[PDB]
Amino acid sequence: GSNRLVVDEAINDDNSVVSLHPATMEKLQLFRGDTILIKGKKRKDTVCIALADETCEEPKIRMNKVVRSNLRVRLGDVISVHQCPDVKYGKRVHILPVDDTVEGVTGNLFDAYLKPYFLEAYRPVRKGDLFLVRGGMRSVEFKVIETDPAEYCVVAPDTEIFCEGEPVKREDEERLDDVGYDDVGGVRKQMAQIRELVELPLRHPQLFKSIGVKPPKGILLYGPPGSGKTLIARAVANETGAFFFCINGPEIMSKLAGESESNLRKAFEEAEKNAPSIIFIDEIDSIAPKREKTNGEVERRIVSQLLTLMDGLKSRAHVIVMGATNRPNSIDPALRRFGRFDREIDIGVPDEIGRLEVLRIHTKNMKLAEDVDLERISKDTHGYVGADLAALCTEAALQCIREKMDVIDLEDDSIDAEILNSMAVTNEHFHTALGNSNPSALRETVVEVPNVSWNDIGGLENVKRELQETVQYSPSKGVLFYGPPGCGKTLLAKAIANECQANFISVKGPELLTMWFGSEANVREIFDKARQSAPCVLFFDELDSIATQGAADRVLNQLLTEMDGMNAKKTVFIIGATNRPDIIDSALLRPGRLDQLIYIRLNIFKAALRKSPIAKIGALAKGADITEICQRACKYAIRENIVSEIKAAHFEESMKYAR
Amino acid sequence: AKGADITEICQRACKYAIRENIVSEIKAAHFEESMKYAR
Ligand SMILES: Nc1ncnc2c1ncn2[C@@H]1O[C@H](COP(=O)(O)OP(=O)(O)O)[C@@H](O)[C@H]1O
Ligand SMILES: Nc1ncnc2c1ncn2[C@@H]1O[C@H](COP(=O)(O)OP(=O)(O)O)[C@@H](O)[C@H]1O
Ligand SMILES: Nc1ncnc2c1ncn2[C@@H]1O[C@H](COP(=O)(O)OP(=O)(O)O)[C@@H](O)[C@H]1O
């Protein structure tokens, strides 16, 4: 319980660095730079360099995906660490590449791939190990085949590497490029629960033989058709170590009740014959078409053979079924009940923070440039799902191919070489490919996190007591923000969640006037979209559409009933905005619907930005058009092309016509 | 006396929970600060 560490995820995806807690390293006589022997299971062991990282837990150790596969261990297992002082540098180490990775790529694995790996990098060696080198639009696994000083060699600039030879084979070594948790970004929190409910029925299939508890059995994934579904299940079963069969919807419908009734039974029989079963019902929208009263006799039996095959079967037999649909409202209601799909999982469009991680993952095999600032691209990529974030990663890597052809001609079948690596991908390959931009998820209810500073407010002493830490031993839950326009009513609730650390949903009046108003309308889709997100603030601007001048005066009443009931939720709040508080029906003001009213001294301080092309105030006070005078001041950019930034003589020309 | 907002003044009195983290429960000097803006 003191040396027994639990393997965890790696902050840095390095095959040699494993991070640990320093107070635990203070117990086991270790500091940075020293090497440690780590043996996990099946008598296998490797050896790596430690580091003092206080981020990890005390009884937990950080291990990388390739470090995990070398010990024949997987995440959630206990490993033992031993001090390794008896180690010395090595003379010769023979490195052969792996068969399943040298696909057409040729040249010299040492000059292109292996040199940058070990250049000034001091790394330990095993006699029988495998490892991955990400470079040149791909990744070629290598194998250590010999070790000169016993089995614990250490590479250094003083080392002779005879990489000459044949592509060695692999032996029960799962592809180190297979899907993993380090390959799924933008849904870290979404992976928390899915990894808290499949962690036991798959990794610990012991208690579930002798416990009367009914374990989770029916998982229902949903989200965007663009991305975020197949990998959520692929990165789990391929990483947790579970048998993975993914039944595709379109194939089943391609029969005449032949492989429609068989593959449904057979794959349900096949997955159960193995102990860890993960069944991915891809395109369940095509199989289950909600309550389709007008259809053919095959959909009335392909869904009729599915429910009976999961309530009778899939009962403590260590089988976790996983559905996948574009919308959780186009499949039969009898799918989500008890035992079958009682679990549901939201896959939302990645926020600005989540877009950056997935950008990193896919942009790893490439060699980029320092002018490339993927952070700036990670901001202006709303409406972009993991597919489109990978779709431009192709058009960004492929634009570098034609733009740098030139001398290379008469391409051989295996012409790739060191030219493939070091292929610097300029930022223009992004911009020109992003010039033909094409997003997908634009009409969606976006879940994200506000990244705006509270300094740019200049308010009127907003009482801090309009907040709570969910620690009490009833509280008001309805507030509205009215007053003049521009004073801050739109950006007001944005900076509140900056300190509260909660998701937000910006909704407008005519947004609820969606043609898809025919109870679980978008109105209720938006309500329940923020129900899973806990806590979540529902901001509503343009609420002036409450009055008159079909379902004209409807949707309001529709909005009314849904507001109540949320008072028991406690961890959810509703805020609105308006400018003409007269034509609004006073219904919302009623207790429960809303329970507070906030207006909007003198002109307050306001924090600007863009302080680089700036040039050096409160007297002008003698917001409304705060940004309007700012952008026009930047628009007054002197074009004396044939130094100057901002100036005063340009302000006086702006207030001549403003209002 | 010299309902309308019966619970409103009650929860705000509990919301006036002194956070002197670095005993006190309900008090009068916190009521007078509540009726300054009520309606
Ligand atoms: N959340 C994510 N994180 C990282 N990559 C993703 C994510 N979602 C999608 N991708 C990438 O997009 C590609 C296609 O998306 P996919 O998962 O097939 O869509 P879906 O599962 O919704 O049909 C995948 O190959 C994957 O690499
Ligand atoms: N302290 C501030 N208060 C209000 N608005 C500000 C402030 N500082 C900058 N602004 C700018 O003024 C604009 C006012 O919000 P806006 O989007 O115009 O919505 P509305 O006019 O409906 O309130 C913001 O977009 C913001 O860029
Ligand atoms: N004697 C009382 N008479 C009325 N309301 C009371 C009384 N004691 C406490 N209250 C509180 O005042 C609130 C008044 O009811 P409310 O839910 O506001 O509906 P409405 O305002 O439409 O009558 C109740 O929710 C209750 O918590």
mmCIF file of C-alpha atoms in Angstrom, chain A residues 3 28-31 33-39 45-50 80-89 123-126 149-154:
data_model
loop_
_atom_site.group_PDB
_atom_site.id
_atom_site.type_symbol
_atom_site.label_atom_id
_atom_site.label_comp_id
_atom_site.label_asym_id
_atom_site.label_seq_id
_atom_site.Cartn_x
_atom_site.Cartn_y
_atom_site.Cartn_z
ATOM 1 C CA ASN A 3 5.155 1.012 -2.773
ATOM 2 C CA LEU A 28 11.724 6.122 -1.356
ATOM 3 C CA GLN A 29 15.058 8.009 -1.550
ATOM 4 C CA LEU A 30 14.754 9.501 -5.030
ATOM 5 C CA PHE A 31 15.022 12.838 -6.830
ATOM 6 C CA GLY A 33 17.278 12.371 -13.067
ATOM 7 C CA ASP A 34 17.628 8.987 -11.358
ATOM 8 C CA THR A 35 16.416 5.822 -13.086
ATOM 9 C CA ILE A 36 13.924 3.305 -11.683
ATOM 10 C CA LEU A 37 13.019 -0.281 -12.602
ATOM 11 C CA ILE A 38 9.253 -0.735 -13.000
ATOM 12 C CA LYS A 39 7.852 -4.268 -13.218
ATOM 13 C CA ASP A 45 9.801 -4.919 -16.662
ATOM 14 C CA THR A 46 11.302 -1.771 -18.134
ATOM 15 C CA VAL A 47 13.299 1.143 -16.711
ATOM 16 C CA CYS A 48 12.717 4.896 -16.907
ATOM 17 C CA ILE A 49 13.677 8.296 -15.483
ATOM 18 C CA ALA A 50 11.502 9.896 -12.805
ATOM 19 C CA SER A 80 5.949 -1.921 -8.279
ATOM 20 C CA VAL A 81 8.917 0.452 -8.532
ATOM 21 C CA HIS A 82 12.460 -0.559 -7.580
ATOM 22 C CA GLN A 83 15.576 1.577 -7.289
ATOM 23 C CA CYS A 84 17.987 0.882 -10.165
ATOM 24 C CA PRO A 85 21.487 2.082 -9.207
ATOM 25 C CA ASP A 86 23.267 -0.801 -10.974
ATOM 26 C CA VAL A 87 23.127 0.696 -14.466
ATOM 27 C CA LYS A 88 25.734 1.973 -16.917
ATOM 28 C CA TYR A 89 25.930 3.403 -20.421
ATOM 29 C CA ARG A 123 17.219 6.765 -22.291
ATOM 30 C CA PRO A 124 17.339 3.258 -20.782
ATOM 31 C CA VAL A 125 16.975 0.027 -22.753
ATOM 32 C CA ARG A 126 15.459 -3.451 -22.396
ATOM 33 C CA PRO A 149 25.694 -4.154 -20.952
ATOM 34 C CA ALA A 150 23.478 -6.939 -19.530
ATOM 35 C CA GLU A 151 19.816 -5.924 -20.095
ATOM 36 C CA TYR A 152 19.991 -2.363 -18.692
ATOM 37 C CA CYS A 153 21.722 -0.241 -21.327
ATOM 38 C CA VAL A 154 21.477 3.556 -21.495
#
